[PDB]
Amino acid sequence: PVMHPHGPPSHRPWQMKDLQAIKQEVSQAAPGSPQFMQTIRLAVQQFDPTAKDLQDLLQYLCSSLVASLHHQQLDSLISEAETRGITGYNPLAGPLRVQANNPQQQGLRREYQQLWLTAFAALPGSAKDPSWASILQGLEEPYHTFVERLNVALDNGLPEGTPKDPILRSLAYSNANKECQKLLQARGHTNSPLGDMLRACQAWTP
């Protein structure tokens, strides 16, 4: 992090307590999901991290594969942004990442943080086996409990700005047990269909 005294800027290493608190706030959110993004967005604001700090934070929160995909995307976003013009970037003063580690280069650091943040958008979709696809209703699970069970896994797994209602509707079916799955040819029809698949199983005697 880069410290801002009340009365020059200086870098200080991450404190494990702060990293730990970030991971606990991210909770079960997958990289790119809303909770994940709000968390690391708040962290970048609070700690004004350098490029090196951001690399430590990445490896603490995400798997080694995810970290590599992030690096690939971030490199492309960097190249593209260089053409448009990066504030504080002297192409003759060495690699941009080295420059972003100079705590005096605030503008350049703030730009790098924003590209670092934006890079997470491309990460989902490269995960073809999310956990929310696995959540499946057992022969014993109630239906009303299962629909919420899927809602949270989608809340934690789906990237930002992605439809969830059309996902849960199919998932509340494709991932339901064969027990209650037989009430799904006369499925009720409403405006928000979700209210129906529950009406069908609003009362389900085992």
CSV table of C-alpha atoms in Angstrom, one decimal:
chain,number,residue,atom,x,y,z
A,1,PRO,CA,0.0,0.0,0.0
A,2,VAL,CA,1.0,3.7,-0.5
A,3,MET,CA,0.6,5.7,2.6
A,4,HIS,CA,-0.7,9.3,2.6
A,5,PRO,CA,0.4,11.1,5.8
A,6,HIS,CA,-1.6,14.0,7.1
A,7,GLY,CA,1.6,16.0,6.9
A,8,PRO,CA,5.6,12.4,1.4
A,9,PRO,CA,4.1,9.2,-0.1
A,10,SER,CA,5.8,6.0,0.9
A,11,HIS,CA,5.1,2.3,0.2
A,12,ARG,CA,4.6,-0.2,3.0
A,13,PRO,CA,4.1,-3.9,2.6
A,14,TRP,CA,0.7,-5.6,3.0
A,15,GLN,CA,-0.3,-6.5,6.5
A,16,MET,CA,-1.6,-10.0,6.7
A,17,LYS,CA,-4.6,-8.9,8.8
A,18,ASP,CA,-5.8,-6.6,5.9
A,19,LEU,CA,-5.3,-9.3,3.3
A,20,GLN,CA,-7.2,-11.8,5.5
A,21,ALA,CA,-10.1,-9.4,6.0
A,22,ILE,CA,-10.4,-8.9,2.2
A,23,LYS,CA,-10.5,-12.7,1.6
A,24,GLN,CA,-13.2,-13.1,4.3
A,25,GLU,CA,-15.3,-10.3,2.7
A,26,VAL,CA,-14.9,-11.7,-0.8
A,27,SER,CA,-16.3,-14.8,1.0
A,28,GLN,CA,-17.2,-17.5,-1.5
A,29,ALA,CA,-17.5,-15.0,-4.4
A,30,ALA,CA,-15.8,-16.2,-7.6
A,31,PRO,CA,-13.5,-13.8,-9.4
A,32,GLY,CA,-15.6,-11.3,-11.4
A,33,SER,CA,-18.8,-11.8,-9.4
A,34,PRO,CA,-20.4,-8.6,-7.9
A,35,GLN,CA,-19.3,-9.3,-4.3
A,36,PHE,CA,-15.7,-10.1,-5.5
A,37,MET,CA,-15.5,-6.9,-7.5
A,38,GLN,CA,-17.0,-4.6,-4.9
A,39,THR,CA,-14.6,-5.9,-2.4
A,40,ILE,CA,-11.4,-5.5,-4.3
A,41,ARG,CA,-12.7,-2.2,-5.6
A,42,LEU,CA,-13.0,-1.0,-2.0
A,43,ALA,CA,-9.6,-2.5,-1.2
A,44,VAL,CA,-7.9,-0.6,-4.0
A,45,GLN,CA,-9.4,2.6,-2.8
A,46,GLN,CA,-8.4,2.1,0.9
A,47,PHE,CA,-4.8,0.9,0.3
A,48,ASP,CA,-3.8,2.7,-2.9
A,49,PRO,CA,-1.7,-0.3,-3.8
A,50,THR,CA,1.2,-0.3,-6.2
A,51,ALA,CA,1.4,-2.7,-9.1
A,52,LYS,CA,3.5,-5.1,-7.0
A,53,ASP,CA,1.0,-4.9,-4.1
A,54,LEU,CA,-1.8,-5.8,-6.6
A,55,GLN,CA,0.1,-8.9,-7.7
A,56,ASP,CA,0.4,-10.0,-4.1
A,57,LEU,CA,-3.3,-9.4,-3.6
A,58,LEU,CA,-4.2,-11.4,-6.7
A,59,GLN,CA,-2.2,-14.5,-5.7
A,60,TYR,CA,-3.7,-14.3,-2.2
A,61,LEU,CA,-7.3,-14.4,-3.4
A,62,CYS,CA,-7.3,-16.4,-6.6
A,63,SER,CA,-5.9,-19.7,-7.9
A,64,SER,CA,-2.7,-19.8,-9.9
A,65,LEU,CA,-4.5,-20.4,-13.1
A,66,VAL,CA,-6.9,-17.5,-12.6
A,67,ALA,CA,-3.9,-15.3,-11.8
A,68,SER,CA,-2.3,-16.2,-15.1
A,69,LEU,CA,-5.4,-15.5,-17.1
A,70,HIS,CA,-5.7,-12.1,-15.3
A,71,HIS,CA,-2.1,-11.3,-16.3
A,72,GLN,CA,-2.8,-12.2,-20.0
A,73,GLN,CA,-5.9,-9.9,-20.1
A,74,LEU,CA,-4.1,-7.1,-18.2
A,75,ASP,CA,-1.2,-7.2,-20.6
A,76,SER,CA,-3.7,-6.7,-23.5
A,77,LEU,CA,-5.5,-3.9,-21.8
A,78,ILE,CA,-2.2,-2.3,-21.1
A,79,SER,CA,-1.0,-2.4,-24.7
A,80,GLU,CA,-4.4,-1.0,-25.9
A,81,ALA,CA,-4.3,1.8,-23.3
A,82,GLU,CA,-0.8,2.7,-24.2
A,83,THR,CA,-2.0,3.6,-27.7
A,84,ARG,CA,-4.8,5.9,-26.3
A,85,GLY,CA,-2.3,7.6,-23.9
A,86,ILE,CA,-1.5,6.7,-20.3
A,87,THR,CA,-1.1,9.5,-17.8
A,88,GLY,CA,2.3,9.5,-16.1
A,89,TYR,CA,3.8,6.9,-18.4
A,90,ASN,CA,7.2,7.8,-19.9
A,91,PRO,CA,7.9,5.1,-22.5
A,92,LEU,CA,11.6,5.8,-22.1
A,93,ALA,CA,11.6,5.5,-18.3
A,94,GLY,CA,11.3,1.7,-18.3
A,95,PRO,CA,8.6,-0.9,-18.0
A,96,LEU,CA,5.3,0.6,-17.0
A,97,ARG,CA,5.0,-1.8,-14.0
A,98,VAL,CA,8.3,-0.6,-12.6
A,99,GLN,CA,7.1,3.0,-12.9
A,100,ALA,CA,3.8,2.2,-11.2
A,101,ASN,CA,5.8,1.0,-8.2
A,102,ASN,CA,7.3,4.4,-7.7
A,103,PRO,CA,5.0,5.8,-5.0
A,104,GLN,CA,5.6,9.4,-6.3
A,105,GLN,CA,3.9,8.3,-9.6
A,106,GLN,CA,0.3,8.6,-8.3
A,107,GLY,CA,-1.4,9.2,-11.6
A,108,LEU,CA,0.4,6.3,-13.2
A,109,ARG,CA,-0.4,4.1,-10.2
A,110,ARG,CA,-4.1,5.1,-10.2
A,111,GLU,CA,-4.3,4.2,-14.0
A,112,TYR,CA,-2.7,0.8,-13.4
A,113,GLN,CA,-5.1,0.0,-10.7
A,114,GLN,CA,-8.1,0.8,-13.0
A,115,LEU,CA,-6.7,-1.5,-15.7
A,116,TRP,CA,-6.0,-4.1,-13.1
A,117,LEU,CA,-9.6,-3.9,-11.9
A,118,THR,CA,-11.0,-4.0,-15.5
A,119,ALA,CA,-8.9,-7.1,-16.3
A,120,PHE,CA,-11.1,-9.3,-14.1
A,121,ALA,CA,-14.1,-9.0,-16.5
A,122,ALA,CA,-12.6,-11.5,-19.0
A,123,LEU,CA,-11.8,-14.1,-16.3
A,124,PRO,CA,-15.2,-15.7,-16.0
A,125,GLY,CA,-16.2,-17.8,-19.0
A,126,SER,CA,-12.8,-19.3,-18.8
A,127,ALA,CA,-14.2,-21.2,-15.9
A,128,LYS,CA,-16.3,-23.9,-17.7
A,129,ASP,CA,-17.0,-25.9,-14.5
A,130,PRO,CA,-18.4,-23.4,-12.0
A,131,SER,CA,-19.7,-24.8,-8.7
A,132,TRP,CA,-23.2,-23.4,-9.3
A,133,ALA,CA,-23.6,-25.9,-12.1
A,134,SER,CA,-23.0,-28.7,-9.6
A,135,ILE,CA,-25.6,-27.8,-7.0
A,136,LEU,CA,-28.2,-30.6,-7.5
A,137,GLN,CA,-31.3,-31.5,-5.5
A,138,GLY,CA,-30.9,-34.8,-3.7
A,139,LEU,CA,-33.6,-37.4,-3.3
A,140,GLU,CA,-34.3,-35.9,0.2
A,141,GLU,CA,-33.8,-32.2,-0.3
A,142,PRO,CA,-36.9,-30.0,-0.1
A,143,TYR,CA,-37.6,-27.9,-3.2
A,144,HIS,CA,-38.0,-24.5,-1.5
A,145,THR,CA,-34.7,-25.0,0.2
A,146,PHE,CA,-33.0,-26.0,-3.0
A,147,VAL,CA,-34.2,-22.9,-5.0
A,148,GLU,CA,-32.5,-20.6,-2.5
A,149,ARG,CA,-29.5,-23.0,-2.5
A,150,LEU,CA,-29.1,-22.2,-6.2
A,151,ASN,CA,-29.8,-18.5,-5.8
A,152,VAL,CA,-26.7,-18.0,-3.5
A,153,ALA,CA,-24.4,-20.1,-5.7
A,154,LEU,CA,-25.5,-18.0,-8.7
A,155,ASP,CA,-25.1,-14.8,-6.6
A,156,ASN,CA,-21.5,-15.9,-5.8
A,157,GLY,CA,-20.6,-17.4,-9.2
A,158,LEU,CA,-22.1,-15.4,-11.9
A,159,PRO,CA,-20.2,-12.4,-13.2
A,160,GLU,CA,-21.6,-8.9,-12.9
A,161,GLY,CA,-24.2,-7.7,-15.4
A,162,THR,CA,-25.4,-11.3,-16.2
A,163,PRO,CA,-29.0,-12.5,-16.2
A,164,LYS,CA,-29.9,-14.7,-13.2
A,165,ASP,CA,-33.6,-15.1,-13.5
A,166,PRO,CA,-33.4,-17.1,-16.8
A,167,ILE,CA,-30.5,-19.1,-15.3
A,168,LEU,CA,-32.3,-20.1,-12.0
A,169,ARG,CA,-35.5,-21.0,-13.9
A,170,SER,CA,-33.6,-23.6,-16.0
A,171,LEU,CA,-31.4,-24.6,-13.0
A,172,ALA,CA,-34.2,-25.0,-10.6
A,173,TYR,CA,-35.3,-27.7,-13.1
A,174,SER,CA,-32.3,-29.2,-14.7
A,175,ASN,CA,-30.7,-29.6,-11.3
A,176,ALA,CA,-33.8,-30.8,-9.4
A,177,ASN,CA,-34.2,-34.4,-8.3
A,178,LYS,CA,-36.3,-36.9,-10.2
A,179,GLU,CA,-38.7,-36.9,-7.2
A,180,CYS,CA,-40.5,-33.5,-7.7
A,181,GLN,CA,-39.4,-33.3,-11.4
A,182,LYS,CA,-42.7,-34.8,-12.5
A,183,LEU,CA,-44.8,-31.7,-12.0
A,184,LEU,CA,-42.9,-30.0,-14.8
A,185,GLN,CA,-45.1,-30.4,-17.9
A,186,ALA,CA,-48.1,-28.5,-16.5
A,187,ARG,CA,-45.8,-25.8,-15.1
A,188,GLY,CA,-47.6,-22.6,-14.2
A,189,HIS,CA,-47.2,-19.6,-16.5
A,190,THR,CA,-46.8,-16.1,-15.0
A,191,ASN,CA,-44.8,-12.9,-15.6
A,192,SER,CA,-41.8,-13.9,-13.4
A,193,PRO,CA,-42.0,-17.7,-13.9
A,194,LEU,CA,-40.0,-18.3,-10.7
A,195,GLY,CA,-43.1,-18.0,-8.7
A,196,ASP,CA,-44.6,-21.0,-10.4
A,197,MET,CA,-41.9,-23.7,-10.0
A,198,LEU,CA,-42.3,-23.0,-6.2
A,199,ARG,CA,-46.1,-23.1,-6.4
A,200,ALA,CA,-45.8,-26.6,-7.8
A,201,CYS,CA,-43.5,-27.7,-4.9
A,202,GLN,CA,-44.9,-25.3,-2.4
A,203,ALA,CA,-46.3,-28.5,-0.8
A,204,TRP,CA,-44.2,-31.6,-1.3
A,205,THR,CA,-44.8,-34.7,0.9
A,206,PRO,CA,-41.6,-36.9,0.8
